[PDB]
Scaffold this active site. Structure first.
Site, PDB file in Angstrom:
ATOM      1  N   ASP A   4       3.885  -4.206 -18.111  1.00 56.09           N
ATOM      2  CA  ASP A   4       3.556  -5.513 -18.635  1.00 56.09           C
ATOM      3  C   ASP A   4       2.801  -5.439 -19.954  1.00 56.09           C
ATOM      4  O   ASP A   4       2.685  -6.459 -20.641  1.00 56.09           O
ATOM      5  CB  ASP A   4       2.722  -6.302 -17.620  1.00 56.09           C
ATOM      6  CG  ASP A   4       3.502  -6.566 -16.362  1.00 56.09           C
ATOM      7  OD1 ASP A   4       4.697  -7.031 -16.510  1.00 56.09           O
ATOM      8  OD2 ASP A   4       2.995  -6.362 -15.244  1.00 56.09           O
ATOM      9  N   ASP A  42       4.541 -14.306 -27.390  1.00 56.89           N
ATOM     10  CA  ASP A  42       3.392 -13.900 -26.603  1.00 56.89           C
ATOM     11  C   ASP A  42       2.074 -14.256 -27.259  1.00 56.89           C
ATOM     12  O   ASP A  42       1.033 -13.717 -26.859  1.00 56.89           O
ATOM     13  CB  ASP A  42       3.421 -12.412 -26.257  1.00 56.89           C
ATOM     14  CG  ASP A  42       2.780 -12.103 -24.948  1.00 56.89           C
ATOM     15  OD1 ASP A  42       3.023 -12.844 -23.964  1.00 56.89           O
ATOM     16  OD2 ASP A  42       2.041 -11.101 -24.866  1.00 56.89           O
ATOM     17  N   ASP A  51       8.073 -17.746 -21.197  1.00 59.14           N
ATOM     18  CA  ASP A  51       6.738 -18.144 -21.638  1.00 59.14           C
ATOM     19  C   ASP A  51       6.685 -19.084 -22.810  1.00 59.14           C
ATOM     20  O   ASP A  51       5.605 -19.590 -23.121  1.00 59.14           O
ATOM     21  CB  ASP A  51       5.821 -16.952 -21.984  1.00 59.14           C
ATOM     22  CG  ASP A  51       5.773 -15.905 -20.922  1.00 59.14           C
ATOM     23  OD1 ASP A  51       5.840 -16.235 -19.723  1.00 59.14           O
ATOM     24  OD2 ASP A  51       5.614 -14.704 -21.282  1.00 59.14           O
TER      25      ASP A  51
END
Length: 300
Positions: free
Chosen positions: A273, A88, A126
């Site tokens: 989230d 992330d 991601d």
């Protein structure tokens, strides 16, 4: 007799596994009185997320237990690997293994746990899409780690492996196809789209068909967990606990894309989230209200 050659979609033919111990199931069972929204969500097959909380020393047994349970249920387990170093890019879902050596050891252990058992693996939501946050050399390392995952996990012939490829408003199809080709998407079943996001299935089919054409006909899955109302209006952080979103199509192989193997719920509805600039719960924490909102907004 004669033996036919091979034909097909590895995801067709048995139901997707419903995790009996998910946070949604715990919440649905605890609801007093029973709640229609929570029960519906809890009974929908999702995916089981694994990360650096499951060390290389033990994750193999965790994986074998889960895939063996799914097999005992006559169902296809979906596992999401979310352990990449610099996960992330240090934002709300920060984590991952410390080093590439640790990540490789983790993958080796996951593959040991899979054995020859059926599984669907979503590799690193991601990671490829977000990789430009890294320096050139750490970006290359990341690509090498994703390639390592493909090469190692696909030794389970019964693993249907999908490398995460972002979504239709992240990288271009050309840019993402180049990354997928670099990490050996041809050795996998293909790629995943829309994980933890909200774009319409139709938009994601068009994007997935384009990437498929640039990756020698690879196949894909779309996360339809939260896309029933499409995305919130274009803004920073519109992906971070937005309101007004709805559950999308339940998981199925009856899709509208020529190379779309399935609609899956990869994100687990109800999980936050992130803190999202508002002091909301840590990324991944289950919030019953969030699951209920998604179901209410879908008319349930």
């Amino acid at each position: 007799g004669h033996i036919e050659g091979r034909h097909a979609n590895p995801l067709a033919g048995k139901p997707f596994y419903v995790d009996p111990a998910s946070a949604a199931m715990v919440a649905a069972r605890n609801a007093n009185p029973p709640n229609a929204e929570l029960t519906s969500v809890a009974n929908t097959p999702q995916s089981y997320w694994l990360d650096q909380a499951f060390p290389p020393a033990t994750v193999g047994g965790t994986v074998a237990r889960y895939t063996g349970a799914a097999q005992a249920a006559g169902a296809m387990p979906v596992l999401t690997l979310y352990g990449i170093p610099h996960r992330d890019c240090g934002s709300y879902a920060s984590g991952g293994f410390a080093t590439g050596t640790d990540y490789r050891g983790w993958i080796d252990a996951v593959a040991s746990g899979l054995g020859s058992s059926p599984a669907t693996i979503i590799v690193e939501p991601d990671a490829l899409a977000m990789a430009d946050c890294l320096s050139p050399d750490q970006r290359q390392e990341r690509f090498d780690l994703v390639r390592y995952a493909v090469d190692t996990l696909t030794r389970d012939p019964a693993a249907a492996v999908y490398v995460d490829a972002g979504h239709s408003r992240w990288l271009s199809a050309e840019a993402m196809a180049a990354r997928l080709n670099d990490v050996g998407v041809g050795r996998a079943r293909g790629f995943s789209l829309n994980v933890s996001n909200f774009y319409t299935t139709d938009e994601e089919i068009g994007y997935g068909e384009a990437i498929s054409g640039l990756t020698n006909g690879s196949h894909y899955v779309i996360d339809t967990s939260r896309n029933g109302a499409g995305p919130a209006p274009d803004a920073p952080l519109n992906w971070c606990n937005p309101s007004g979103r709805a559950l999308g199509a339940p998981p199925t192989t009856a899709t509208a894309g020529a190379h779309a193997d399935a609609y899956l719920w990869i994100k687990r509805p109800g999980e936050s989230d992130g803190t999202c600039g508002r002091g909301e719960p840590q990324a991944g924490r289950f919030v019953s209200q969030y699951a209920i909102d998604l179901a209410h907004n879908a008319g349930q």
